[PDB]
């Protein structure tokens, strides 16, 4: 039963039905697990001082007329906020000035930070800064192990014993070389790179202000918390796929595919899971339905037409259609667009424009009866082409104007050709022409006027006069 089908709907239904829906107790348990993981991640990220440093820097930037208070803290768990930030700054400075009390004061600072409701973007910035620093530390560590374990070929267990804990000194530097083995004394050339890696680690440690093992502990603790939260969210999504499908059932004939609708519903369900709260006592379905229907409707308004229409205009069109239907049902027959202005609040032209908005375009390959098996696309002609009669008239006019310009004097022909875009890429202004010819602008104008008068004189340009078709 693994195959014998082609439609992906059946396979999706099978994969979805392989799992079973939850109950209220399971929802409460999953919410509790999510809260526990979030609290663990919050503690792990508050236990670091660089979070407080970034908080103080952002607060200083806000106070320096460079940002706003809206994206600083998402409420509280505004003079009170200012005094709390001042207290946090004082706690941080006394923590930096109390380098055996540093650990306890860091714990107190972390508790006060957790007492503050920051912004998710700020929390993500703290998380990615932690990731950057731990990635630098682990890159240095892998360079350290590659420089002697994979280069000096020094023993595994010996490396583990003399490297677990120190990670800073020459315990892995001189021992791997001066241990009287035939393959040990051959990499004083890479000893320099070993020293450079040690200096890089020392600089990173000085910048961080803490050890390395505690950093690794925080990193893997928050990784475990994130994995637990992801597992719980995946369980919730797999449980509520059925509700997503049930909600998406009712929009299957609005220009969008059922699979697209259910995918948008899944996205909305994930968004709702990301913000669900179980302390209110309400069931998850009531909170998820709003998000799912909002996502489905937004997708329908966005990507269900060949020509995109804004959400507000789509809502206006829907409201107009609903009114019109209600008035038709109540009164008896189709009303007039002028009468809709009395019922609604419109200047009587917006309704006309909405009605004049073009519907979905007609298919090019639609047939018209038999018509010797011909479609609509066989009766559309290109309007951008120029007639051969027009091209021949243009060629004749060019020849005639060239012949007429040959008769005039050389200077007159040159100044004419310069004034008008004739036989050249572009025309030249009267001032540039005068400058090129070393002749004043007014004299150029007078010579042009004399030429025009001579051309207006009769017994010439008879074909030019004949070039008018009126």
């Amino acid at each position: 039963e693994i195959g014998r089908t082609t439609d992906p709907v059946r396979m999706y239904m099978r994969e979805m039905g392989t799992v079973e829906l939850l109950t209220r107790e399971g929802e409460i348990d999953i919410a509790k697990r999510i809260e526990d993981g979030i609290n663990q991640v919050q503690c792990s990220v508050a236990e670091y001082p660089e979070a407080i440093t970034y908080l103080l820097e952002q607060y200083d930037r806000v106070e320096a007329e460079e940002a706003r208070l809206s994206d600083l803290i998402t409420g509280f768990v505004p003079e009170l906020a200012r005094e709390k930030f001042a207290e946090l700054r004082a706690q941080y400075v006394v923590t930096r000035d109390t380098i055996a009390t540093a650990q306890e004061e860091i714990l107190k600072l972390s508790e006060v930070f957790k007492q503050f409701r920051l912004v998710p973007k700020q929390f993500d910035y703290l998380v990615n800064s932690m990731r950057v620093m731990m990635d630098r530390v682990r890159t240095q560590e892998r360079l350290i192990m590659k420089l002697c374990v994979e280069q000096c070929k020094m023993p595994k267990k010996n490396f583990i014993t003399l490297f677990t804990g120190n990670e800073t000194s020459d315990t892995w530097f001189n021992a791997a070389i001066a241990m009287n083995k035939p393959w040990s004394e051959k990499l004083h050339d890479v000893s320099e790179e070993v020293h450079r890696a040690l200096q890089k680690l020392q600089q990173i440690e000085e910048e961080t202000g803490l050890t390395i093992e505690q950093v690794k502990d925080i990193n893997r603790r928050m990784s475990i918390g994130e994995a637990k939260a992801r597992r719980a969210k995946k369980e919730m999504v797999e449980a509520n796929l059925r509700l997503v499908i049930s909600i998406a059932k009712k929009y299957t004939n609005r220009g969008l595919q059922f699979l697209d609708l259910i995918q948008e519903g899944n996205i909305g369900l994930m968004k709702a899971v990301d913000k669900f709260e179980y302390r209110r006592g309400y069931k998850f379905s009531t909170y998820a339905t709003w998000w799912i229907r909002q996502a489905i409707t937004r997708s329908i308004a966005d990507q269900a037409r060949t020509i995109r229409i804004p959400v507000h205009m789509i809502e206006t069109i829907n409201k107009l259609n609903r009114i019109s239907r209600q008035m038709l049902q109540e009164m008896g027959r189709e009303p007039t667009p002028e009468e809709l202005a009395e019922r609604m609040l419109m200047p009587e032209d917006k309704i006309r424009k909405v009605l004049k908005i073009a519907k979905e375009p007609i298919s090019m390959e639609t047939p018209i009866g038999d018509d010797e098996d011909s479609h609509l696309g066989d009766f559309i002609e290109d309007t951008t082409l120029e007639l051969p009669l027009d091209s021949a008239t243009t060629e004749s006019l060019r020849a005639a104007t060239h012949d007429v310009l040959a008769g005039l004097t050389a200077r007159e022909a040159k100044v004419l050709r310069m004034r008008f875009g004739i036989d050249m890429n572009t025309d030249y202004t009267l001032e540039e022409v005068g400058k090129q010819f070393d002749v004043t602008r007014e004299r150029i104008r007078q010579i042009e006027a004399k030429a025009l008068r001579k051309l207006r004189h009769p017994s010439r340009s008879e074909v030019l006069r004949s070039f008018l078709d009126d």
Binding site: E338, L397, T401, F420, L468
Partner: protein, 50 residues
């Protein structure tokens, strides 16, 4: 197009603001006009024929 500015300068002609899109009898057919009907949209002033 080029040389049309020169032609207009010589002839002092102005370009038509409107384009002729009038209805005309198809070629090769003759006859007599027996009925004329005019339909107009609401809000548009009617003319003498209407």
């Amino acid at each position: 197009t080029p040389e049309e500015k020169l032609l207009r300068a010589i002839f002092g002609e102005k370009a038509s603001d409107v384009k002729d899109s009038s209805l005309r009898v198809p070629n090769g057919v003759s006859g007599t006009v027996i009925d004329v009907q005019v339909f107009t949209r609401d809000g548009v002033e009617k003319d003498k024929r209407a």
